[model samples]
Target: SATQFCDQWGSVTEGNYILYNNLWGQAQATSGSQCTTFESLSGNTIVWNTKWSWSGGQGQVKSFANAALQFTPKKLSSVKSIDSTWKWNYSGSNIVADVAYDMFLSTSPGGDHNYEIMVWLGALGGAGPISSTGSPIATPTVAGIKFNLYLGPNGSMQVYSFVAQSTTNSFSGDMRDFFTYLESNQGLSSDLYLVDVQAGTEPFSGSNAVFTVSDYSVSVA
Candidate 1:
């Protein structure tokens, strides 16, 4: 069976994933509306989309409508790989946002994330990541895509963002490659616990924006 939710904080669990209309930043918007619909779930794959129209809140994120994978926490050193594939597209106009994979790591199970890693597949309308120096620290190629790597602090946690050199609406690879790169070059620890994996869009300001995830799948091993 399939389910859909459209309210602020609305959520539904289908298979091993939870789909959410996570309007965590909606208050930032002066006016707008957003809805998320979960079309279906089969095994590890899911199909879904979100439609939104927003105005005001120029640089503030309005929402993150995402599908979160449910799994037991794993240590970075013990996990072999995190495999993922996603194909998505967007339509409408005057959109300022990003389509990305948001993963978090922590020091303990069921704890607040101490490190946030975002893989930005699409950066639209001058959308940028949180960075300490106001620019990417490096541009590294991982999983065959070149990304501008950024580092910044957010709410007592360190945020690392990988913004693709070009918009990538489709991606497939082992997520551990990112962790490995960070560990080897950025002083990230292998002892951190993998907390959650979520794929979604973060909208700063947009109108008639419809983001469609035609197919998506992810697994941790």
Candidate 2:
């Protein structure tokens, strides 16, 4: 979301994603990612609880306007688990298709950050089983484009992360920073994120599509 700044005496209000607790029956604003308390509907007052806080079998259930908190009994032997979500900065469409690309992450999206080449996938191309030489190379022309990720061959059809370059040309960033995060964070396996080379760079086709890369990821245990 775009962050807006209020001008002096502009009589403007800032828009933000927030959670509020109206059950407290008060009027105030609590600005934080954690949803603990809420008051008032006007001004910067939020309208929901964004925080996840559960204590064993029972805990306090707070509510905000137009929202309610309720609980019910569950199986005594049921195990508890935490729901986690993964996000990525770049994807395949952003670059070449079917071609491998290392994943990366930064505190700020497209901000000054590090990169690394991680896994290796098949040569991104029109189609077919074509292999390429994965090595560190100058940044490819494809960067800052929207792309998609998927498990290969024997893997299931699970759309994984997104990818893109940090700046105009940062292939090293892809290998140095992004690949490290994908391995350390996303738990990806196998050779992925082909470097520099695009589909049809070589004269061969099928599994013999010979491609070269200036950057690649080494075996990490």
Candidate 3:
């Protein structure tokens, strides 16, 4: 008999996968319904669409290059509140991280120049904060560069887009400006920041993800 013994199953493996904490060494223990089975778990909480089957299994992998998926504004029966909620999902590979995008209205599909207010968001969660005071005097009007706000996924971390109030009437200014004023020029205190995981990616994976936003609003000068 051996004097000491260790369970190799509990050992860490260096694969292209991140193991769920629940299954790290609890293979011998029951993890209830929240955890996936070892046989079906690939360490990827965002399962490849190919993994789903209907009759039997289609066995196909969908691929798109630099393909960005968008979700149109789903009007809430009536604009009871100024805030509106829009949602999108990532289902691709080689996506960008920390890039900014714009969320504005257009007169037609793929239209330009019709963008109204600009809200900047990061592609990663907990990266920054937002505010509604002391923004710059100038309104943003650049043609290019994504101007979307970063709202976090369904994990512990979260990102939000809300209509912020300001003493000024400029529709275009850095989020930091308002936040700076609100927090009394504390710099990082009053401003808002957002994050986005690129295509085929989701922030804080291994957990459910949901993105929500409060409608944009305006204030008197």
Candidate 4:
């Protein structure tokens, strides 16, 4: 009843969502392997997992096995709420990974990506955020969780990462609040389109690591 695959570009479409085995940076790893499983979709919630073993690339992310929901892109200003719930965990030795929600913004619907926003729930084994200054630009608490805001550039996009001060393996909150904070403080325009919302892990190095999402869901209104 489950579809599993291991490849650099393997993907599975289930219902209104797609799970990706995106080994985007596997070349950085001298030796590694990962498999993503499209476990099930019950109601609006999706359950999935990825098992991986990697080594050699100390600072490069080997892959991101993620689940992405398909929906019409919405302008950030028009979005009233982006509610999400996630329950996940990781098990392994010397795991260097981050469990995060990744999103992209552009000036038009499905337009050229101009910015990237990441909400990190867990940064394990000294994993860090994208920071140009080597420190947080701001410390903000949204949805009852304190986070260190970091800024940097990834490709041509301005990257903003809100890394949790402490790990949150289980989370439920409004993701729009982070956008509100960004618009108010970071000069992020509300006219930008919210093009993508993805949940996944970026594994750098580890042994016998398994990342699992038991109940994951998100919706925009």
Candidate 5:
């Protein structure tokens, strides 16, 4: 079933996918609006889109309209794979945003997140990732793409961002690569709980922006 949603915290859940109009930063928009559409679902694939407009509070994010996966939280080491494929695009002018996959790690299956991991595929309009020094800790290649790995602190959590060196608007890769890299190099243990997995855009500012996802499929095994 196709559905349209525009509330600040509206969401639609179908099958294993949950679409959220996460306007957590909307208060800073000054003047802006967002509408999300939950189009369809088939097995592990979900289709969705978001249209928005924002002005004022130049560098502040207004929202993150995303499709999240629903799965029992499990240890990264115990889990074998998380393969995902996505194809999406953005339309409109000067859309300050980052199209990315957002995941979280927690100490327990039902505990507060202690770490945030972001794999940025599209960084548009001078948008940047979280970094303590405004620079990457390492330049690593994963899933056939090179990225700038940045480390920083955000409130109660540690943030790790892997920003693509070039735009990757279409992607098909194993999400586990990110965890393996962290475990092998950054002392991050695979014993941590993989609690959350969401993919979409985080908007700062835009004029008649439309972010559309044609195909998004994820499987965890």
Candidate 6:
């Protein structure tokens, strides 16, 4: 079955996918409104979009409205692939944000997240990733696409962000390549348990922004 959610912190479950209006950073906002709607779900694919307007939270993320992939946690070595496709577009003013796939890993399946990996498909209005040195540590090509890699600390986790060299509003590929790259080149261990996978946009500050994900799908095996 398909459903939609339109409240702050609202959510809906359709098949294995869960849609969320995760306005976790709204308190820092001076004024704005946001709502998420889940349009449909077919097999592993979900169609959804979020409409929002925000202000006064410059350099700070205001929310993450995303479709979360549901599955039992597994070690990176045992997992075969994570295939995904996303088609999206945006319309608005002064919008600083990033559309990305966010994943987390930990030493144990149920333990706190120790590592965060982000694959940024697009950087809007100069939105930047978390970095200790405020610059990309490396520029690596994975899955035939080049990305600027940054490292930083976020809470208890070490954030590794792969920002695409250009905006890729439409993408389809194996997400495992990112994990493999990190394992071989960045000291990420295959023993780390995959804890979560979420794809969405993080709005720092914007007005009348309508971020639409017309089609999205992801799966782990």
Give per-model CA RMSD.
0.9, 23.1, 19.8, 0.8, 0.8, 1.1
Q: Pairs clashing in candidate 1?
A: none
Assess the local accuracy of residue 106 in candidate 5 as a C-alpha lDDT between 0 and 100: 99
In model 3, the Cα lDDT at residue 190 comes to 12
Q: How accurate is candidate 3 locally (lDDT)?
A: 0.23
The CA lDDT of each predicted structure is 0.92, 0.24, 0.23, 0.91, 0.92, 0.91
TM-score of each: 0.98, 0.20, 0.19, 0.98, 0.98, 0.97
Give per-residue CA lDDT, model 2, range 113-198, as digits (tens).
Answer: 23233222333323222112222222332222332332322122222233223221222222233333345555744233221211
Count of backbone clashes for each model? 0, 48, 30, 0, 0, 0
Q: How many Å off is the CA of 202 in candidate 6?
A: 0.2
lDDT of 4 by residue, 1-221 (tens): 69999989999987767899999999998998999988889988999999999888777888888889888999998999989999999999999999999999999995888999999999999787777997999999988999999999978899999999999999999999999999999899999999998999999999899998998998888
Tens digits of per-residue lDDT for model 3, 1-221 = 10111222221111222212122222222221121111222222222111100111111111111112223332222112222112223233322212122233333434432222223333433223232332332332222222222233222222233222221112333332322232342222211221111222112221132221111221111
TM-score of 4: 0.98
RMSD of model 1 against the true structure: 0.9
| Candidate 6: stretches off by over 4 Å | 1-4
lDDT, candidate 5, at 14: 85
lDDT of 3 at 211: 22
Location of the lowest summed lDDT over 10 successive residues in candidate 3? 49-58
lDDT by residue (24-77, candidate 5, tens digit) is 898997798999998888878888899999888877888889999999999998
Best by lDDT: 5
Q: For residue 193, what is the lDDT in candidate 4?
A: 96
Q: Write the per-residue lDDT of candidate 1 for residues 87-124, one digit (tens) a residue.
A: 99999998899999999999997899899999999999
